Design a protein around this nucleic acid. Sequence first.
DNA 1: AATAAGAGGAAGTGGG
DNA 2: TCCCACTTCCTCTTA
Length: 91
Amino acid sequence: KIRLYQFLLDLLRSGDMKDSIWWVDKDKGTFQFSSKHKEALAHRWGIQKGNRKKMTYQKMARALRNYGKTGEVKKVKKKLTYQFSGEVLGR
DNA sequence: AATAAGAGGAAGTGGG
DNA sequence: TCCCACTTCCTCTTA
Ligand SMILES: N=C(N)c1ccc(OCc2cccc(COc3ccc(C(=N)N)cc3)n2)cc1
């Protein structure tokens, strides 16, 4: 099954949820969730995964924080903004 | 307060 | 056995 950062990157490349997530600086890999429409994206993540409970943005971001140490995604000091690593962007 | 974003320990679940 | 890659729950902090 797909990993959360690849789910997000695929969305950004495809544009299927442009109202929920967008690039801020795509050359840098920085991207931002919609304040009002991120839950719809979180819901799609849970359904894609087949999880038992409804996915929320809060639980999705709990998981995103775990990439901080390994580096795939880091929190940026801007509202609802994160950054993919160059490795993730290259692959 | 109400609302929202942000945080992480810890326990539980998947699929190796 | 025991790590993967989250998921779920709870309690809290900051703005
Ligand atoms: N269960 C426990 N014992 C426990 C005890 C203490 C905890 O602390 C959590 C914690 C620590 C440090 C910083 C923060 C929040 O940071 C933020 C920064 C910026 C914003 C914003 N831009 N609005 C919002 C939040 N939250 C967590 C659990």
